[PDB]
């Protein structure tokens, strides 16, 4: 059901990984590293950011049920991506995905002979892992991403190509860097991203004659208290991330 893959902050604290002796903070790293590996492979495999995003949500959800101590990010990322590419109608061949995973994880090794018993074996490992992901997600694979809603929002509120560009950037980074996708609906996250993007660009969208703030047309539940709270978290993690902000920094 609806409330199934959204978790409270206390639920996020007592995660499967926590039960096996992983710090809150270590676990957060394990997730960010998975999102990075997913982004690197996806770029090399030439799948869309959408597929990459979908794979990131799978990974996020998969680790609310499973522990990093039992399933390594470096094993789950490729499988999640292999699956997400099928689901988003950009199937990549199994052998192909294994090969790109290998170069990312081991730039200096050289692929085993595709005839070796040890390579036939790593193919079998991925297939087994994909099946475990499907069962962990209970075959719920249709993912909604904030990006859909950013376009809607930043457009109907008359934003420069620029402002819109910064909002998508934030949306993409909220997946790599945070667990918002486990806590807030995509329409809310989109508001969070547009909000920070405005703040980052010194832009303010004017209050309507009715007295309605822009976001009330996006999600009726959303409050400024919450918007400011979440943008602050997102901005803080962005600051801890080397070069990430440089990408949107107005250098003129």
């Amino acid at each position: 059901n609806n409330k199934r893959w959204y978790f409270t902050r206390e639920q996020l604290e007592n995660s499967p990984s926590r039960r096996f002796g992983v710090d809150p903070d270590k676990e957060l790293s394990y997730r960010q590293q998975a999102a990075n590996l997913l982004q690197d492979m996806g770029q090399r495999l030439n799948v869309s950011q959408l597929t990459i995003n979908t794979a990131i949500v799978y990974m996020h959800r998969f680790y609310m049920i499973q522990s990093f101590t039992q399933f390594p990010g470096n094993s789950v990322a490729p499988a999640a991506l292999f699956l997400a590419a099928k689901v988003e109608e950009q199937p990549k061949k199994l052998e192909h995905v294994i090969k790109v995973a290998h170069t990312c994880l081991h730039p200096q090794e050289s692929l085993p002979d595709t005839r070796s018993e040890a390579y036939l074996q790593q193919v079998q490992d991925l297939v087994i892992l994909e099946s475990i992901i499907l069962q962990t997600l209970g075959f719920e694979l249709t993912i909604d991403h904030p990006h859909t809603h950013v376009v809607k929002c930043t457009q109907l509120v008359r934003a420069s190509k620029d402002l819109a560009q910064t909002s998508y950037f934030m949306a993409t980074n909220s997946l790599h860097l945070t667990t918002f996708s486990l806590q807030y609906t995509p329409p809310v996250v989109a508001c969070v991203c547009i909000h920070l993007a405005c703040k980052w660009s010194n832009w303010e969208i004017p209050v309507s004659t009715d007295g309605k703030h822009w976001w009330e047309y996006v999600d009726a539940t959303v409050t400024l208290e919450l918007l400011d709270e979440l943008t602050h978290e997102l901005l803080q993690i962005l600051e801890k991330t080397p070069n990430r902000l440089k990408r949107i920094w107005n250098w003129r």
């Binding site: 099928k86 099946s131 209970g138």
Partner: protein, 298 residues
């Protein structure tokens, strides 16, 4: 071993009897509720979990409606899709002489059918396998569209061409069309409607040419006057096309008799996909709104 909150083991259901030839009729061990378990096939599956099953699962999870088959859950051990069990199907009932529908009831069947189509198309899904054998009727006389393993979401588009069982496959596809839409399902709806009286698939080709010939001997012939722009298909100039030839209403005049039924069928089995009536207008046709009025099933 590994935790699994959201995928139940299929052992919760008790296997009663093979059907598909792996599809089983089964009984929930606690409640007795009868269901159908369809194993997901794994022969020649070289690329992990079959993209065709992912797609179907994706669509079934989306489509929730009184006239669309209902996927209850997915179960592990293989992997099984669980459906509400349904005893009958339009193909079985129509090929069964003891079974008899009144005109009042036929109206109800087409009504439910068209409503199912209207709904799935509304959700940007093409069924792509319209045939009597894919239409279910539940013990309570409720019609459900079933078998979405060949269905596809829709939105110059280049969709797959070898789709829909041959006898129900529309002119467009039999001419090499790849930018088609919901009308392909409506053509199939037509073939099923006529089948409600004739008790047998009206057009039984053996090859693509044989099917296209049969269509011409019924709908008149493929003509740029009748079907604006038809001659842009390279498979039109190539393959054999007849000349002279409209007999939709005469050949069916026998079985049906009712004016309205014949008029709708003429509008479903229309050559130009863009002039073929859609689910919304069909439901609105006088056939469902003149006497006798549509009645429930038993």
């Amino acid at each position: 071993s590994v935790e699994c909150p959201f995928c139940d083991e299929v052992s919760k259901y008790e296997k009663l009897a093979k059907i598909g030839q792996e599809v089983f009729k089964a009984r929930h061990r606690k409640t007795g509720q009868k269901v159908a378990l369809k194993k997901v096939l794994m022969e020649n599956e070289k690329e992990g979990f079959p993209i065709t099953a992912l797609r179907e699962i994706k669509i079934l999870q989306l489509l929730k409606h009184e006239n669309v088959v209902n996927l209850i859950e997915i179960c592990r051990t293989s992997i099984y899709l669980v459906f509400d069990f349904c005893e009958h199907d339009l193909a079985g009932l129509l090929s069964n002489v003891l079974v008899k529908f009144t005109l009042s009831e036929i109206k109800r069947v087409m009504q439910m059918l068209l409503n199912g189509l209207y709904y799935i198309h509304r959700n940007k899904i093409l069924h792509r396998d319209m045939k009597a054998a894919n239409v279910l009727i539940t013990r309570d006389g409720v019609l459900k569209l079933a078998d979405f393993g060949l269905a596809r979401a829709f939105s110059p588009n280049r969709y797959t061409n070898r789709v829909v069982t041959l006898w129900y496959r529309p002119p467009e596809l039999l001419l090499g069309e790849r930018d088609y839409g919901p009308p392909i399902d409506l053509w199939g709806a037509g073939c099923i409607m006529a089948e409600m009286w004739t008790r047998s698939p009206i057009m039984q080709g053996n090859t693509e040419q044989h099917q296209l010939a049969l269509i011409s001997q019924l709908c008149g012939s493929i003509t740029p006057e009748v079907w604006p722009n038809v001659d842009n298909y390279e498979l039109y100039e190539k393959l054999e096309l007849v000349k002279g030839q409209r007999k939709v209403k005469d050949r069916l005049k026998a079985y049906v008799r009712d004016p309205y039924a014949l008029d709708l069928i003429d509008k479903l089995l229309v050559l130009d996909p863009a002039q073929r009536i859609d689910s919304d207008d069909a439901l609105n046709h006088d056939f469902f709104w003149s006497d006798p009025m549509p009645s429930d099933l038993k």
